[PDB]
């Protein structure tokens, strides 16, 4: 339980990139792979 161990000085810091931003990065990479292929990694899509 998080609120049984947090009372001893332990604190869980939230990550910088949330799940939504990681999902957006994943969707962008998938769209670039499907539409462009390998061109969006070297230069323009």
């Amino acid at each position: 339980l998080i609120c049984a161990q947090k009372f001893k000085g332990l604190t869980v810091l939230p990550p910088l990139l949330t799940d939504e931003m990681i999902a957006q990065y994943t969707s962008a990479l998938l769209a670039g792979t499907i539409t462009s292929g390998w061109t969006f990694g070297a230069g323009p899509a």
Partner: peptide, 29 residues
């Protein structure tokens, strides 16, 4: 959080883990 003493002296405080209702303000996760 400070932009650096070389450019400004303004600072911002962040209380990591509270709801900021027992102490501009912007409630974050």
């Amino acid at each position: 959080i400070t932009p650096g003493t070389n450019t400004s002296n303004q600072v911002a405080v962040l209380y990591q883990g509270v709801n900021c209702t027992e102490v501009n303000v912007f409630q974050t996760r």
